[PDB]
Design a protein around this nucleic acid. Structure first.
Lengths: 153, 274, 571, 168
DNA sequence: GATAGTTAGAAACGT
DNA sequence: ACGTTTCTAACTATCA
């Protein structure tokens, strides 16, 4: 089923691209998942977790990354940012999916990632952010996924 | 004949009063003159029984400003070459039109000087003012189809049906692209949901549909297109209060959204079939 | 919350084996029997260093010489957690942590480098504990005394080392002079039960509403309470409209209602007009011509950056490519038309206006020359009437301004009166009285100079304020009474952020008399079952293992988990 | 703020005049464009702050998200293969996270600093929105107030004396 | 696979 | 009690 209502479009509001920006959250949130710790999560498991590659207040604190997801969420919750509620929006930003997750995954269903030399200042930044996200979900379990992402799926 | 070449001497001028103009040359300073005052620019034939070569352009009174076209070569190609060279820029392929509305000006003043037999003093300052107005108009319409075309859009063709002004066409072209830029920038940050636009512009039938029927039952003496005149000016005042885009948005929004309807098939300010 | 230590790990420097587990039974009274200088008294700095301590009080030349990683495991209300921490060694005390979390915790071998920073561990403990994220600063001075409260800040009333059990000067863990006394007098009403997460948000929300009150009441309602002089002149300046009379002016001042008078108020020299046609509907649309050039110049500069910021356009369905991919691939090929700006835009901005400045300001100077009722009289009257009507209640009880005063400013008094500081003081005094009346129940279970004198504390200093003379081991009895009182109060509470474990270290350091320590273990027996098995007590002493065998709530782990010392020499 | 509410008449007075100037009209259009871009920035920040406040503070009265059985809710928001091959495994794997553990996770993680900062941001951005909306209302007129003649200059100075004689 | 390189980690003052 | 200044370390891209 198609993803844009033909010529009955309100406006071209898809700056977030459903088939061009993300496939499995730029398709390299499962390649880094296979790279760090091999767990499949392909046939039925859920990628509708972290569309903060699709938010320009959290994608900026993901370029400066540590090496664990809990450290990133702790870097959300200090006095440098005066924040911490937006980690709890993993709970909120998947109900109606304003970030168009679970819609920008139909187009997805192992060739190399496109190299960092072809920068374009946004696409490779989101590729790095989503590889960080994909390698950070391989170190956690489902109870950990409900624990540190603060969700009740 | 003279109208195709009278603008040529006016281009090399700076309030110099290039006069277009036997049965003449007894006028000794009939009107107020200027320092240059390019005189006696009227020949159409070669030598005849009256000797026109008495001074042979030596360059009435002591020092003569006589200058005439040799060979009667009316409407040349070097008239157009005097605009690409010498002064001014432009040259965006609408230059035959600029020439067509600048030969009309000298044709109109020559028709005014055909009757009412006083001298035919032509202001170079007024020629420069008319040429500047033509240049401003054509620069203004070459600003358009760049900020509008991504020929003519479907929200500007229908805005020319009522055709209130050109500044409203400006505000439509500015507001539509600025609204698109703000929606792109909101989608860059994820500030406004994708489904929020259906909750904001499909509910503008509380303006287009209840104020489309408000003044139609109020005003009935409007024959064809003036019944859609004040509907636009009431929509532009009754739509900048809407809190359906979560928080209320700025005044630049919901004007270019109304212009964003008319790019596709919709109901609009036109009271006709389109 | 439910937060109890299960087992303590001491990894070696990868010699053969033995990560050195020191286990503890859940919801019991845990004791190990000690030798003279086995070093068991340094387990409290080990567990505190694993919890997220900035410093490291693990002793030198005994434990730090042969240990790489230090880890502890604490069971939560749901699942468990293990917090490892590497040896500090050369870099003062600045290791980072290994923090794993699962339903059950297994101890691996040495795990080389760390994976999680220590502030991450502190933040995870805070979000488990349910402490408020607020900075506790009701004046916002950036204080450390009034700061965000942590579970590391809640490590007080959880450890009783050797140096403070027989000391009345220091009551709790690492609060001797000023390290935690300020951040315990800040947080004692919050942990006693006087405040909560929703209660602590009020004291700055009321400051935000006070800022809104100072915003609205800065004018002191000019449109409402400071416009009587305008109504005094509303029936007085209409005689100037008779002088500057084009419309029908007022017939008589004392013949109409003031509402009717306001409804009445609502309503050769032609060369200035013959010049003024190029400054009313020609220069105004010339300002609009400037809006064609300059605004669209900065828009084409901005939409250049907007299209540059769109550098990102580059199951078996059938319409997923031609209408969803192909428009994006087409719009990627259409970005190249947006970087270009025509030269005529800035040409009309600069050069066309510089040819036109003499074409418009010349008639402005002509209007000034020929400008030497009136011309500006109907301007100064009509329009000022519109501004006066739009200044007096055009939107007062309809849309905004004074409408919000009847809604928003009637909630400031509601927020000020529903929870005042009087309610805070009353609730903290009720909780302090509850923890004082709960405290004296172990006085028959223990022995002091008076086993019936009602002991008490106060928030402002956190010291022993019973009703001293003939002291000694009685300080330990007051200590265990006040710690069991506070922990029983936290166990009987709802949403208490405090871990329910108290670690005691050498009660018999003043004695070495077994009857007193027997009654101390009797009090520890009693205190677990008052809240129906929600408390842990860890005792570290040289007392014999027979002091828990006749006790229902008492546990031994067979000395040092069948060892001779805390550090095994066979590493 | 009275200074930001009266930023006009410090530009529009010499926009109107007395004598006009095309450079003054250019400067006033530049300052009006700066005020409008500030209005757009305040609009974006205020919309983001109030959207986050209306999103996060919904748990004060967390919630079960219930992405299970969403073959009947999210199936028709798109413009069957989305369901039967992607969401049909996801229908049987969305309930494998909440129902796999017996006790759901209750309210953990405070939002107090975030709520206080977001409400202060709401107050400051609403104040700046009101100031720049008054700025745009004075600088743009209602519909027809642009005039440098003897009438509209009088209307502008009447509005100036009405908004200055009382509001200090 | 190497120079940078950015981010992660270290130590004292705040109070 | 950790944020807020400077500093070094390191691993990992980015070119070997």
């Amino acid at each position: 089923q198609m993803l844009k209502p033909e010529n009955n479009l309100e406006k071209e509001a898809w700056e977030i691209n459903n088939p061009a920006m993300c496939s499995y959250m730029l398709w390299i949130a499962t390649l880094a998942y296979y790279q760090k710790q091999k767990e499949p999560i392909h046939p039925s498991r859920l990628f509708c977790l972290f569309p903060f590659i699709l938010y320009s207040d959290t994608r900026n604190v993901l370029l400066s990354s540590k090496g664990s997801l809990k450290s990133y969420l702790a870097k959300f919750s200090n006095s440098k940012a005066i924040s911490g509620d937006i980690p709890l929006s993993i709970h909120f930003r998947i109900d109606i999916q304003k970030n168009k997750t679970l819609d920008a995954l139909i187009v997805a269903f192992s060739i190399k990632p496109l190299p960092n030399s072809k920068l374009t200042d946004t696409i490779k930044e989101l590729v790095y952010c989503s590889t960080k996200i994909g390698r950070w979900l391989s170190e956690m379990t489902n109870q950990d996924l409900a624990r540190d992402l603060k969700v009740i799926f | 004949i003279q109208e195709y070449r009278l603008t040529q001497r006016l281009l090399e001028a700076n309030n110099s009063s290039c006069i277009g103009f036997n049965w003449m040359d007894l006028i000794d300073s009939g009107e107020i003159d200027v320092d240059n005052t390019i005189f006696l620019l009227f020949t159409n034939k070669r030598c005849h029984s009256e000797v026109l070569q008495l001074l042979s352009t030596s360059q009435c009174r002591l020092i003569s400003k006589f200058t005439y076209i040799y060979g009667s070569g009316s409407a040349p190609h070097d008239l157009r070459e005097s605009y690409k060279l010498h002064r001014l820029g432009a040259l965006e392929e609408h230059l035959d039109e600029i020439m067509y509305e600048i030969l009309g000006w000298v044709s109109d003043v020559l028709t005014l000087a055909a009757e009412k037999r006083q001298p035919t003093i032509v202001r170079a300052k007024d020629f420069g003012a008319r040429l500047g107005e033509i240049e401003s108009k054509y620069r203004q319409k070459t600003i358009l189809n760049y900020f509008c075309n991504r020929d003519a859009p479907n929200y500007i063709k229908q805005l020319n049906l009522i055709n209130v002004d050109d500044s409203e066409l400006e505000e439509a072209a500015i507001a539509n692209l600025e609204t698109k830029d703000a929606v792109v920038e909101w989608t860059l940050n994820g500030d406004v949901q994708d489904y929020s636009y259906r909750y904001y512009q499909r509910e503008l039938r509380r303006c287009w549909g209840i104020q489309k029927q408000k003044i139609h039952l109020d005003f009935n003496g409007r024959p064809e297109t003036e019944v859609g005149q004040r509907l636009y000016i009431e929509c532009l005042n009754n739509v900048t209060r809407y809190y359906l885009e979560n928080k209320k948005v700025g005044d630049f929004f919901a004007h270019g959204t109304l212009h964003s309807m008319a790019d596709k098939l919709t109901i609009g300010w036109h009271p006709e079939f389109d | 919350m439910f937060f109890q230590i299960e087992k303590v790990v001491l990894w070696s420097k990868e010699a053969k084996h033995k990560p050195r587990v020191i286990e503890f039974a859940l919801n019991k009274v845990n004791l190990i029997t000690g030798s003279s200088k086995s070093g068991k008294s340094s387990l409290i700095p080990i567990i505190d260093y694993c919890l997220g301590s900035s410093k490291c009080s693990i002793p030198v030349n005994t434990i730090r010489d042969t240990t790489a990683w230090y880890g502890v495991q604490i069971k939560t209300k749901h699942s468990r957690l293990l917090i490892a921490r590497r040896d500090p060694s050369n870099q003062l005390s600045t290791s980072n942590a290994f923090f794993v979390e699962a339903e059950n915790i297994e101890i691996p071998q040495n795990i080389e480098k760390h994976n999680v920073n220590i502030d991450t561990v502190k933040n995870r403990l805070n979000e488990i504990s349910g402490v408020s994220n607020i900075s506790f600063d009701f004046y916002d001075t950036g204080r450390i005394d009034k700061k965000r409260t942590s579970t590391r800040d809640l490590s007080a009333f959880n450890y009783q080392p050797q140096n403070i059990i027989a000391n009345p000067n220091a009551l709790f863990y690492k609060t001797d002079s000023f390290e935690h006394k300020s951040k315990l007098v800040t947080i004692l009403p919050y942990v006693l039960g006087a405040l909560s997460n929703t209660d602590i948000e009020n004291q700055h929300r009321i400051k935000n509403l006070e800022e809104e009150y100072r915003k609205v009441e800065r004018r002191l309602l000019k449109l409402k309470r400071q416009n009587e002089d305008w109504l005094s002149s509303a029936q007085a300046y209409v005689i100037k409209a008779m002088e500057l009379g084009l419309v029908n002016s007022d017939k008589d001042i004392y013949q109409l209602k003031p509402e009717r008078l306001l409804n009445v108020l609502k309503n050769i020299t032609k060369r200035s007009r013959d010049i003024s046609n190029n400054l009313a509907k020609v220069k105004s649309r010339l300002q609009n011509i400037n809006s064609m050039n300059r605004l669209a110049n900065t828009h084409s500069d901005a939409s250049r950056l907007k299209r540059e910021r769109l550098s990102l356009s580059k199951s078996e369905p059938n319409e997923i490519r031609s209408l969803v991919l192909e428009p994006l691939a087409r719009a990627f090929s259409n970005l190249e038309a947006e970087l270009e700006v025509p030269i005529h835009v800035q040409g009309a901005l600069s050069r066309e206006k510089i040819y036109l400045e003499g074409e418009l300001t010349r008639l402005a100077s002509e209007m000034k020359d020929v400008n030497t009722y009136d011309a500006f009289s109907v301007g100064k009257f009509v329009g000022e009437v519109e501004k006066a009507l739009s200044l007096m209640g055009e939107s007062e009880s309809e849309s905004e301004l004074s409408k919000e005063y009847k809604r928003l400013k009637k909630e400031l008094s509601v927020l000020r009166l529903k929870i005042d500081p009087r309610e805070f003081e009353r609730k903290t005094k009720l909780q302090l009285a509850k923890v004082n009346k709960l405290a004296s129940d172990w006085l028959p279970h223990l022995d002091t100079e008076n086993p019936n004198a009602p002991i008490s504390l106060h928030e402002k200093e956190l010291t022993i304020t019973v009703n001293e003379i003939g002291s000694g081991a009685n300080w330990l009895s007051y200590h265990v009474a006040i710690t069991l009182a506070l922990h029983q109060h936290f166990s009987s509470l709802e949403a208490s952020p405090v871990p329910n474990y108290i670690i005691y270290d050498q009660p018999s350091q003043v004695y070495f008399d077994i009857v007193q320590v027997k009654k101390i273990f009797e009090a520890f027996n009693g205190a677990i079952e008052k809240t129906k098995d929600n408390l842990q007590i860890i005792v570290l002493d040289h007392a014999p293992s027979t002091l828990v065998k006749s006790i229902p709530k008492g546990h031994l782990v067979e000395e040092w988990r069948n060892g001779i010392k805390l550090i095994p020499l066979d590493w | 703020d009275w200074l930001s509410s009266a930023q006009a008449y410090v530009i529009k007075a010499m926009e109107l005049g007395y004598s006009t100037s095309a450079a003054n009209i250019k400067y006033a259009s530049e300052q009006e464009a700066e005020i409008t871009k500030r209005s757009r920035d305040i609009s974006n920040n205020l919309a983001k702050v109030k959207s986050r406040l209306q999103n996060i503070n919904s748990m004060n009265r967390r919630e079960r998200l219930s992405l299970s059985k969403w073959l009947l809710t999210q199936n028709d928001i798109n413009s069957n293969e989305i369901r039967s091959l992607v969401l049909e495994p996801l229908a049987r794997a969305f309930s494998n996270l909440e129902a796999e553990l017996e006790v759901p996770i209750h309210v953990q993680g405070a939002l107090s600093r975030e709520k206080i900062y977001l409400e202060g941001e709401l107050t400051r951005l609403a104040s700046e929105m009101k100031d720049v909306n008054t700025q745009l209302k004075i600088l743009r007129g209602n519909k027809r107030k642009l005039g440098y003649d003897a009438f509209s200059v009088g209307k502008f100075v009447g509005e100036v004396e009405k908004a200055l004689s009382l509001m200090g």
